[PDB]
Design a protein around this motif. Structure first.
Motif, PDB file in Angstrom:
ATOM      1  N   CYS A 179     -50.371  36.474  52.435  1.00  0.00           N
ATOM      2  CA  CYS A 179     -50.401  36.070  51.038  1.00  0.00           C
ATOM      3  C   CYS A 179     -50.710  37.263  50.143  1.00  0.00           C
ATOM      4  CB  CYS A 179     -51.430  34.958  50.789  1.00  0.00           C
ATOM      5  SG  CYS A 179     -50.996  33.345  51.486  1.00  0.00           S
ATOM      6  N   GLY A 200     -46.173  35.118  48.747  1.00  0.00           N
ATOM      7  CA  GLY A 200     -46.499  35.578  50.082  1.00  0.00           C
ATOM      8  C   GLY A 200     -45.441  36.503  50.643  1.00  0.00           C
ATOM      9  N   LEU A 227     -54.080  31.726  52.559  1.00  0.00           N
ATOM     10  CA  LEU A 227     -52.997  31.140  53.338  1.00  0.00           C
ATOM     11  C   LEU A 227     -53.383  29.728  53.766  1.00  0.00           C
ATOM     12  CD1 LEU A 227     -50.264  31.355  54.537  1.00  0.00           C
ATOM     13  CD2 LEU A 227     -51.202  32.618  56.476  1.00  0.00           C
ATOM     14  N   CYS A 283     -48.836  29.600  50.409  1.00  0.00           N
ATOM     15  CA  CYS A 283     -49.929  30.332  49.787  1.00  0.00           C
ATOM     16  C   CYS A 283     -50.443  29.551  48.586  1.00  0.00           C
ATOM     17  CB  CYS A 283     -49.491  31.735  49.355  1.00  0.00           C
ATOM     18  SG  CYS A 283     -49.171  32.912  50.702  1.00  0.00           S
TER      19      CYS A 283
END
Ligand SMILES: *[C@@H]1O[C@H](CO[C@@H]2O[C@@H](C)[C@@H](O)[C@@H](O)[C@@H]2O)[C@@H](O[C@@H]2O[C@H](CO)[C@@H](O[C@H]3O[C@H](CO)[C@@H](O)[C@H](O)[C@@H]3O)[C@H](O)[C@H]2NC(C)=O)[C@H](O)[C@H]1NC(C)=O
Ligand SMILES: *[C@@H]1O[C@H](CO[C@@H]2O[C@@H](C)[C@@H](O)[C@@H](O)[C@@H]2O)[C@@H](O[C@@H]2O[C@H](CO)[C@@H](O)[C@H](O)[C@H]2NC(C)=O)[C@H](O)[C@H]1NC(C)=O
Ligand code: NAG
Ligand code: NAG
Length: 326
Positions: A91, A74, A97, A118
């Motif tokens: 992400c 991320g 996410l 993530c």
């Protein structure tokens, strides 16, 4: 002077008590605002006999939240990482996410809401349609599939697919729209007049069955030789046998396709359906020649009016297929 004045405004702090003037000996206390912690300097001050307030060494600095700069798979926009600033989350491709997209540094120095992670986008196993089979499938994660994975569908025999055969695992975790296999049948193709038709010996004819047409001598075809049973139940095309036509007049040079030909030699076995020829006609206005076309239509060919024909033996006149002009 002899009475001390209002104290200096210090950033991110407050003063109790706050008066426009103080008498010597009175005490004031600097305390940092919530979310700000006291570092260098001391807060409490007492008024001297002289009116001057002592120099202020106090420095209130914002509380620092734990480091949150690394999101595994991320990207984080963060800047300062201290009270009261906010940080944002995102992400990478193929990842969703799993939590809040924004976090804030509180007064206590704790991120709230808690920091997200993530996680990979995972797709459930595809559900096969009723009359379809799974031609290829490779599950990357367990039996499940990851982002941009594909499955292709093969219809059962005697069935026709409607819709695209390829499904991708999308960004939201749902497969793309699925195709439908339907059983479609085709009615028997009627035999053409003066011709024959062929198809396999089956009680019913299904999708993609193909029939081959033909015509007897003297009759050509005006359609495709092989037709196919399409997805919609009707055949690719219906073809018919159209009558070849006789040479309309012997001994005449006309225009077939690109070049000049004599009819009698070019169509010894007669014209076919749809063949276009053009005849040469004299024009007595400036003694030039022009070109008028004619074409076979199911055995009947219409000679243009301007064709006035004379025998080759009767070489009294010219064949009027001469001067190019006009
Ligand atoms: C697969 O799912 C797609 C997403 O639908 C939604 O996704 C989840 C995250 C969740 O929100 C849940 O409610 C749904 O399952 C379906 O596609 C559409 O995708 C659109 C594009 O992202 C999206 O919409 C957005 O875009 C329009 C137009 O710009 C905006 O007006 C809107 O406000 C959104 O920003 C939406 O998620 C979704 N809409 C619809 C009507 O489906 C997709 O249909 C689905 N496919 C299958 C085969 O089921
Ligand atoms: C084969 O059939 C398709 C399907 O259209 C037909 O039209 C109806 C009137 C009826 O006869 C049903 O069997 C079918 O739904 C033909 O495709 C049509 O082509 C023209 C082009 O504009 C027009 O009538 C329609 O737009 C088309 N049909 C649809 C559903 O959009 C097709 O012409 C037929 N013949 C061949 C050789 O494919
Ligand atoms: C995958 O295979 C079968 C599906 O029926 C199931 O029993 C098994 O537990 C699955 N395992 C994983 C890791 O997905
Ligand atoms: C739909 O099918 C065609 C094949 O004719 C393919 O080329 C195309 O990629 C398919 N659609 C998508 C979104 O992949």
């Amino acid at each position: 002077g002899r009475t001390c004045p209002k104290p200096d405004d210090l950033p991110f702090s407050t003063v109790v008590p706050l008066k426009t003037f103080y008498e010597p000996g009175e005490e004031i206390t600097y305390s940092c605002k919530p979310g700000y912690v006291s570092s260098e300097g001391v807060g409490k001050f007492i008024c001297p006999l002289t009116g001057l307030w002592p120099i202020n060494t106090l420095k209130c600095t914002p509380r620092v939240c734990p480091f949150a700069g690394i999101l595994e798979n991320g990207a984080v926009r963060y800047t300062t990482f201290e009270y009261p600033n906010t940080i944002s989350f995102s992400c990478n491709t193929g990842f969703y996410l799993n939590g809040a997209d924004s976090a804030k540094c509180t007064e206590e120095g704790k991120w709230s809401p808690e920091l997200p992670v993530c996680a990979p986008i995972i797709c459930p196993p595809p559900s096969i349609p009723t009359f379809a089979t799974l031609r290829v499938y490779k599950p990357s994660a367990g039996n499940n599939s990851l982002y941009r994975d594909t499955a292709v569908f093969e219809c059962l025999p005697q069935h026709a697919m409607f819709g695209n055969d390829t499904i991708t695992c999308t960004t939201h975790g749902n497969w793309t729209k699925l195709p439908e296999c339907r059983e479609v049948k085709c009615p028997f193709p009627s035999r053409p007049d003066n011709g024959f038709v062929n198809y396999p010996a089956k009680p019913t004819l299904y999708y993609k069955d193909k029939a081959t047409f033909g015509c007897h001598d003297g009759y050509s075809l005006d359609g495709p030789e092989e037709i196919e049973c399409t997805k919609l139940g009707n055949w690719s095309a219906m073809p018919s046998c159209k009558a070849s036509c006789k040479v309309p007049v012997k001994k005449a040079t006309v225009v077939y396709q690109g070049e000049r030909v004599k009819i009698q030699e070019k169509f010894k076995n007669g014209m076919l359906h749809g063949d276009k020829v053009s005849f040469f006609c004299k024009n007595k206005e400036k003694k030039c020649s022009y070109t008028e076309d004619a074409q076979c239509i199911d055995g009947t060919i219409e000679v243009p009016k301007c064709f006035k024909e004379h025998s080759s033996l009767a070489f009294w006149k010219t064949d009027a297929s001469d001067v190019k002009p006009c």
